[PDB]
Amino acid sequence: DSVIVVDNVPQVGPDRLEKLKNVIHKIFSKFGKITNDFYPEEDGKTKGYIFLEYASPAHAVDAVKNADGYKLDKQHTFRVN
Amino acid sequence: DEDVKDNWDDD
């Protein structure tokens, strides 16, 4: 109850890959400050999921209920749980 | 990331 997870999060090319984790810090900054951030992969290839942990339960349990599906304007929405 | 629309959080 102190962490968040997202789904349908593919990688992107250069000049934008940074934005992927950067925008995470900006969007989640209104609820508090993120302390833990992990971006796993499959055989060194394109991921689809990430793992973020907050310094408090009230940040995670809030963020999940505030950022439920990001609007990246691509194809399919995300699922923050 | 910058001063633009929050196109990363569906209300």
Side-chain angles (χ1 to χ4, degrees):
Chain A
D1 287 72
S2 268
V3 312
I4 68 163
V5 182
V6 339
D7 216 45
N8 308 335
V9 58
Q11 81 89 249
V12 294
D15 202 47
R16 185 128 196 178
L17 80 178
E18 297 253 77
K19 247 64 157 275
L20 219 192
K21 180 275 222 297
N22 249 126
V23 304
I24 257 73
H25 279 251
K26 289 77 166 91
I27 193 267
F28 288 129
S29 243
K30 55 174 129 271
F31 321 113
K33 198 94 187 182
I34 305 103
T35 173
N36 276 275
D37 29 66
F38 309 91
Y39 280 63
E41 276 191 332
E42 59 195 58
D43 212 273
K45 320 184 81 162
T46 73
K47 68 216 155 200
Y49 126 79
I50 65 121
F51 173 50
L52 241 73
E53 155 181 334
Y54 290 95
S56 329
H59 297 329
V61 308
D62 178 78
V64 171
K65 274 127 170 286
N66 282 256
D68 178 33
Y70 319 122
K71 61 232 178 165
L72 222 190
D73 185 45
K74 250 289 140 162
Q75 278 125 126
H76 306 291
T77 334
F78 314 77
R79 303 294 272 280
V80 186
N81 293 274
Chain B
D1 174 74
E2 67 179 69
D3 283 288
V4 288
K5 235 166 279 173
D6 56 288
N7 64 248
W8 191 251
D9 41 302
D10 206 355
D11 295 271

mmCIF file of all heavy atoms in Angstrom, chain A residues 36-65:
data_model
loop_
_atom_site.group_PDB
_atom_site.id
_atom_site.type_symbol
_atom_site.label_atom_id
_atom_site.label_comp_id
_atom_site.label_asym_id
_atom_site.label_seq_id
_atom_site.Cartn_x
_atom_site.Cartn_y
_atom_site.Cartn_z
ATOM 1 N N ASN A 36 11.753 6.241 -5.130
ATOM 2 C CA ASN A 36 12.176 5.007 -5.779
ATOM 3 C C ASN A 36 11.569 4.908 -7.177
ATOM 4 O O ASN A 36 10.379 5.162 -7.338
ATOM 5 C CB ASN A 36 11.634 3.839 -4.954
ATOM 6 C CG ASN A 36 12.488 3.439 -3.770
ATOM 7 O OD1 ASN A 36 13.428 2.674 -3.902
ATOM 8 N ND2 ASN A 36 12.154 3.899 -2.584
ATOM 9 N N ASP A 37 12.362 4.454 -8.149
ATOM 10 C CA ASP A 37 11.982 4.368 -9.554
ATOM 11 C C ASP A 37 12.751 3.254 -10.283
ATOM 12 O O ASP A 37 13.977 3.285 -10.345
ATOM 13 C CB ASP A 37 12.188 5.741 -10.231
ATOM 14 C CG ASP A 37 13.297 6.633 -9.644
ATOM 15 O OD1 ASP A 37 14.481 6.257 -9.741
ATOM 16 O OD2 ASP A 37 12.939 7.749 -9.187
ATOM 17 N N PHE A 38 12.038 2.279 -10.861
ATOM 18 C CA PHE A 38 12.616 1.136 -11.565
ATOM 19 C C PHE A 38 11.904 0.884 -12.895
ATOM 20 O O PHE A 38 10.673 0.826 -12.972
ATOM 21 C CB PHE A 38 12.546 -0.118 -10.687
ATOM 22 C CG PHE A 38 13.103 0.061 -9.286
ATOM 23 C CD1 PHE A 38 12.254 0.463 -8.237
ATOM 24 C CD2 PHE A 38 14.472 -0.148 -9.029
ATOM 25 C CE1 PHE A 38 12.761 0.619 -6.935
ATOM 26 C CE2 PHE A 38 14.982 0.030 -7.729
ATOM 27 C CZ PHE A 38 14.127 0.417 -6.681
ATOM 28 N N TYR A 39 12.715 0.710 -13.942
ATOM 29 C CA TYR A 39 12.305 0.512 -15.330
ATOM 30 C C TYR A 39 12.861 -0.839 -15.823
ATOM 31 O O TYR A 39 13.941 -0.865 -16.414
ATOM 32 C CB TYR A 39 12.769 1.704 -16.191
ATOM 33 C CG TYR A 39 11.871 2.935 -16.091
ATOM 34 C CD1 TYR A 39 11.709 3.626 -14.871
ATOM 35 C CD2 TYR A 39 11.132 3.346 -17.213
ATOM 36 C CE1 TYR A 39 10.792 4.693 -14.765
ATOM 37 C CE2 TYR A 39 10.253 4.442 -17.126
ATOM 38 C CZ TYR A 39 10.034 5.091 -15.893
ATOM 39 O OH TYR A 39 9.061 6.033 -15.782
ATOM 40 N N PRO A 40 12.175 -1.967 -15.546
ATOM 41 C CA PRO A 40 12.607 -3.293 -15.993
ATOM 42 C C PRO A 40 12.484 -3.430 -17.520
ATOM 43 O O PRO A 40 11.849 -2.599 -18.160
ATOM 44 C CB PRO A 40 11.691 -4.279 -15.258
ATOM 45 C CG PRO A 40 10.397 -3.484 -15.058
ATOM 46 C CD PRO A 40 10.895 -2.052 -14.858
ATOM 47 N N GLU A 41 13.063 -4.492 -18.090
ATOM 48 C CA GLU A 41 13.013 -4.824 -19.522
ATOM 49 C C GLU A 41 12.955 -6.341 -19.742
ATOM 50 O O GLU A 41 13.118 -7.128 -18.808
ATOM 51 C CB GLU A 41 14.232 -4.217 -20.245
ATOM 52 C CG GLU A 41 14.002 -2.751 -20.644
ATOM 53 C CD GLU A 41 15.078 -2.213 -21.593
ATOM 54 O OE1 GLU A 41 16.222 -2.717 -21.529
ATOM 55 O OE2 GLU A 41 14.728 -1.303 -22.378
ATOM 56 N N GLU A 42 12.755 -6.749 -20.998
ATOM 57 C CA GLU A 42 12.687 -8.139 -21.443
ATOM 58 C C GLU A 42 13.870 -8.448 -22.360
ATOM 59 O O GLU A 42 13.940 -7.921 -23.460
ATOM 60 C CB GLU A 42 11.317 -8.416 -22.097
ATOM 61 C CG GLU A 42 10.970 -7.548 -23.326
ATOM 62 C CD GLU A 42 9.481 -7.614 -23.680
ATOM 63 O OE1 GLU A 42 8.661 -7.279 -22.795
ATOM 64 O OE2 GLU A 42 9.180 -8.014 -24.827
ATOM 65 N N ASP A 43 14.840 -9.247 -21.901
ATOM 66 C CA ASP A 43 16.034 -9.633 -22.671
ATOM 67 C C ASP A 43 16.827 -8.413 -23.218
ATOM 68 O O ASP A 43 17.450 -8.488 -24.273
ATOM 69 C CB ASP A 43 15.632 -10.687 -23.729
ATOM 70 C CG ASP A 43 16.758 -11.692 -24.006
ATOM 71 O OD1 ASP A 43 17.617 -11.410 -24.858
ATOM 72 O OD2 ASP A 43 16.731 -12.761 -23.348
ATOM 73 N N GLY A 44 16.781 -7.259 -22.527
ATOM 74 C CA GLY A 44 17.388 -6.009 -23.012
ATOM 75 C C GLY A 44 16.577 -5.298 -24.108
ATOM 76 O O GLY A 44 17.109 -4.399 -24.755
ATOM 77 N N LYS A 45 15.318 -5.697 -24.341
ATOM 78 C CA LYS A 45 14.398 -5.169 -25.356
ATOM 79 C C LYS A 45 13.279 -4.365 -24.681
ATOM 80 O O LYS A 45 13.233 -4.223 -23.459
ATOM 81 C CB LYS A 45 13.816 -6.318 -26.221
ATOM 82 C CG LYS A 45 14.826 -7.418 -26.602
ATOM 83 C CD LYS A 45 14.231 -8.478 -27.539
ATOM 84 C CE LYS A 45 14.223 -7.978 -28.989
ATOM 85 N NZ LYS A 45 14.064 -9.103 -29.931
ATOM 86 N N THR A 46 12.370 -3.828 -25.493
ATOM 87 C CA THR A 46 11.286 -2.911 -25.125
ATOM 88 C C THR A 46 10.417 -3.453 -23.980
ATOM 89 O O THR A 46 9.745 -4.466 -24.148
ATOM 90 C CB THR A 46 10.429 -2.580 -26.366
ATOM 91 O OG1 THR A 46 9.636 -3.682 -26.720
ATOM 92 C CG2 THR A 46 11.231 -2.194 -27.632
ATOM 93 N N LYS A 47 10.394 -2.761 -22.838
ATOM 94 C CA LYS A 47 9.474 -3.034 -21.728
ATOM 95 C C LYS A 47 8.012 -2.703 -22.054
ATOM 96 O O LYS A 47 7.704 -2.167 -23.115
ATOM 97 C CB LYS A 47 9.967 -2.268 -20.491
ATOM 98 C CG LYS A 47 9.857 -0.731 -20.597
ATOM 99 C CD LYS A 47 11.035 -0.032 -19.896
ATOM 100 C CE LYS A 47 11.289 1.357 -20.495
ATOM 101 N NZ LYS A 47 12.661 1.812 -20.179
ATOM 102 N N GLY A 48 7.133 -3.009 -21.095
ATOM 103 C CA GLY A 48 5.714 -2.643 -21.052
ATOM 104 C C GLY A 48 5.174 -2.240 -19.667
ATOM 105 O O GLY A 48 3.989 -1.929 -19.572
ATOM 106 N N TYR A 49 5.995 -2.250 -18.610
ATOM 107 C CA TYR A 49 5.601 -2.000 -17.221
ATOM 108 C C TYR A 49 6.760 -1.297 -16.493
ATOM 109 O O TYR A 49 7.917 -1.463 -16.879
ATOM 110 C CB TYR A 49 5.139 -3.351 -16.602
ATOM 111 C CG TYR A 49 5.799 -3.796 -15.312
ATOM 112 C CD1 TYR A 49 5.395 -3.233 -14.086
ATOM 113 C CD2 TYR A 49 6.801 -4.782 -15.332
ATOM 114 C CE1 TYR A 49 5.969 -3.670 -12.878
ATOM 115 C CE2 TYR A 49 7.364 -5.243 -14.124
ATOM 116 C CZ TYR A 49 6.935 -4.701 -12.891
ATOM 117 O OH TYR A 49 7.422 -5.180 -11.721
ATOM 118 N N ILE A 50 6.447 -0.532 -15.446
ATOM 119 C CA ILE A 50 7.413 0.119 -14.540
ATOM 120 C C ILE A 50 6.980 -0.028 -13.074
ATOM 121 O O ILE A 50 5.816 -0.323 -12.793
ATOM 122 C CB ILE A 50 7.616 1.622 -14.888
ATOM 123 C CG1 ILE A 50 6.344 2.481 -14.682
ATOM 124 C CG2 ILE A 50 8.177 1.840 -16.302
ATOM 125 C CD1 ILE A 50 6.577 3.617 -13.679
ATOM 126 N N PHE A 51 7.898 0.240 -12.143
ATOM 127 C CA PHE A 51 7.668 0.146 -10.707
ATOM 128 C C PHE A 51 8.190 1.417 -10.025
ATOM 129 O O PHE A 51 9.360 1.768 -10.174
ATOM 130 C CB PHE A 51 8.350 -1.130 -10.185
ATOM 131 C CG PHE A 51 8.345 -1.275 -8.672
ATOM 132 C CD1 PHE A 51 7.149 -1.110 -7.951
ATOM 133 C CD2 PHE A 51 9.536 -1.554 -7.971
ATOM 134 C CE1 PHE A 51 7.143 -1.241 -6.555
ATOM 135 C CE2 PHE A 51 9.529 -1.664 -6.569
ATOM 136 C CZ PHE A 51 8.328 -1.514 -5.854
ATOM 137 N N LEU A 52 7.318 2.108 -9.281
ATOM 138 C CA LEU A 52 7.610 3.330 -8.533
ATOM 139 C C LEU A 52 7.187 3.157 -7.066
ATOM 140 O O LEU A 52 6.106 2.639 -6.783
ATOM 141 C CB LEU A 52 6.866 4.512 -9.187
ATOM 142 C CG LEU A 52 7.805 5.610 -9.701
ATOM 143 C CD1 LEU A 52 8.556 5.203 -10.972
ATOM 144 C CD2 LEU A 52 6.991 6.870 -10.005
ATOM 145 N N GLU A 53 8.009 3.623 -6.128
ATOM 146 C CA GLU A 53 7.707 3.590 -4.695
ATOM 147 C C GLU A 53 7.822 5.005 -4.107
ATOM 148 O O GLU A 53 8.774 5.752 -4.369
ATOM 149 C CB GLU A 53 8.535 2.478 -4.004
ATOM 150 C CG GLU A 53 8.777 2.716 -2.501
ATOM 151 C CD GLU A 53 9.611 1.623 -1.815
ATOM 152 O OE1 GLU A 53 9.596 0.467 -2.299
ATOM 153 O OE2 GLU A 53 10.257 1.966 -0.802
ATOM 154 N N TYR A 54 6.821 5.370 -3.306
ATOM 155 C CA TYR A 54 6.796 6.630 -2.572
ATOM 156 C C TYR A 54 7.336 6.460 -1.151
ATOM 157 O O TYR A 54 7.400 5.364 -0.602
ATOM 158 C CB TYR A 54 5.368 7.181 -2.511
ATOM 159 C CG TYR A 54 4.856 7.683 -3.838
ATOM 160 C CD1 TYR A 54 4.092 6.822 -4.640
ATOM 161 C CD2 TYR A 54 5.103 9.006 -4.256
ATOM 162 C CE1 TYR A 54 3.535 7.290 -5.839
ATOM 163 C CE2 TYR A 54 4.527 9.481 -5.453
ATOM 164 C CZ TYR A 54 3.750 8.619 -6.255
ATOM 165 O OH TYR A 54 3.202 9.042 -7.412
ATOM 166 N N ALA A 55 7.652 7.592 -0.522
ATOM 167 C CA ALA A 55 8.104 7.674 0.865
ATOM 168 C C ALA A 55 6.948 7.503 1.881
ATOM 169 O O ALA A 55 7.187 7.513 3.089
ATOM 170 C CB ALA A 55 8.800 9.031 1.057
ATOM 171 N N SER A 56 5.685 7.404 1.424
ATOM 172 C CA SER A 56 4.496 7.319 2.290
ATOM 173 C C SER A 56 3.328 6.581 1.594
ATOM 174 O O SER A 56 3.180 6.724 0.374
ATOM 175 C CB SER A 56 3.993 8.721 2.699
ATOM 176 O OG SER A 56 5.027 9.687 2.807
ATOM 177 N N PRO A 57 2.424 5.909 2.346
ATOM 178 C CA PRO A 57 1.257 5.224 1.787
ATOM 179 C C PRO A 57 0.304 6.216 1.119
ATOM 180 O O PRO A 57 -0.066 6.032 -0.041
ATOM 181 C CB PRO A 57 0.611 4.454 2.947
ATOM 182 C CG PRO A 57 1.061 5.229 4.184
ATOM 183 C CD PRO A 57 2.446 5.744 3.788
ATOM 184 N N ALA A 58 0.003 7.323 1.811
ATOM 185 C CA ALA A 58 -0.859 8.418 1.367
ATOM 186 C C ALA A 58 -0.437 9.040 0.020
ATOM 187 O O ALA A 58 -1.239 9.737 -0.584
ATOM 188 C CB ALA A 58 -0.902 9.485 2.469
ATOM 189 N N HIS A 59 0.796 8.818 -0.462
ATOM 190 C CA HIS A 59 1.248 9.251 -1.790
ATOM 191 C C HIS A 59 0.911 8.209 -2.858
ATOM 192 O O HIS A 59 0.328 8.554 -3.879
ATOM 193 C CB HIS A 59 2.747 9.573 -1.748
ATOM 194 C CG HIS A 59 3.104 10.711 -0.828
ATOM 195 N ND1 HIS A 59 2.292 11.787 -0.539
ATOM 196 C CD2 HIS A 59 4.293 10.883 -0.174
ATOM 197 C CE1 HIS A 59 2.977 12.608 0.278
ATOM 198 N NE2 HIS A 59 4.195 12.076 0.515
ATOM 199 N N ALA A 60 1.229 6.936 -2.611
ATOM 200 C CA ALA A 60 0.912 5.820 -3.497
ATOM 201 C C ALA A 60 -0.602 5.650 -3.682
ATOM 202 O O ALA A 60 -1.090 5.708 -4.813
ATOM 203 C CB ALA A 60 1.568 4.541 -2.957
ATOM 204 N N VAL A 61 -1.341 5.473 -2.577
ATOM 205 C CA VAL A 61 -2.795 5.234 -2.606
ATOM 206 C C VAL A 61 -3.557 6.404 -3.236
ATOM 207 O O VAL A 61 -4.619 6.208 -3.819
ATOM 208 C CB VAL A 61 -3.355 4.897 -1.205
ATOM 209 C CG1 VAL A 61 -2.584 3.749 -0.525
ATOM 210 C CG2 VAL A 61 -3.427 6.127 -0.284
ATOM 211 N N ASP A 62 -2.993 7.614 -3.163
ATOM 212 C CA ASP A 62 -3.495 8.800 -3.837
ATOM 213 C C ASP A 62 -3.122 8.776 -5.328
ATOM 214 O O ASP A 62 -4.017 8.852 -6.165
ATOM 215 C CB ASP A 62 -2.954 10.051 -3.140
ATOM 216 C CG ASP A 62 -3.432 11.307 -3.861
ATOM 217 O OD1 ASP A 62 -4.602 11.694 -3.657
ATOM 218 O OD2 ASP A 62 -2.626 11.808 -4.671
ATOM 219 N N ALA A 63 -1.837 8.660 -5.686
ATOM 220 C CA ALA A 63 -1.354 8.678 -7.066
ATOM 221 C C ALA A 63 -2.097 7.683 -7.973
ATOM 222 O O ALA A 63 -2.528 8.056 -9.067
ATOM 223 C CB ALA A 63 0.147 8.396 -7.031
ATOM 224 N N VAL A 64 -2.319 6.452 -7.493
ATOM 225 C CA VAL A 64 -3.108 5.424 -8.199
ATOM 226 C C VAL A 64 -4.530 5.883 -8.533
ATOM 227 O O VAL A 64 -5.032 5.576 -9.609
ATOM 228 C CB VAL A 64 -3.139 4.134 -7.361
ATOM 229 C CG1 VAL A 64 -4.117 3.079 -7.891
ATOM 230 C CG2 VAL A 64 -1.735 3.519 -7.304
ATOM 231 N N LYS A 65 -5.162 6.638 -7.631
ATOM 232 C CA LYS A 65 -6.515 7.195 -7.764
ATOM 233 C C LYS A 65 -6.542 8.585 -8.419
ATOM 234 O O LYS A 65 -7.623 9.149 -8.550
ATOM 235 C CB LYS A 65 -7.191 7.181 -6.377
ATOM 236 C CG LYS A 65 -7.861 5.821 -6.090
ATOM 237 C CD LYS A 65 -7.417 5.207 -4.756
ATOM 238 C CE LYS A 65 -8.290 4.005 -4.397
ATOM 239 N NZ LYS A 65 -9.632 4.432 -3.954
#
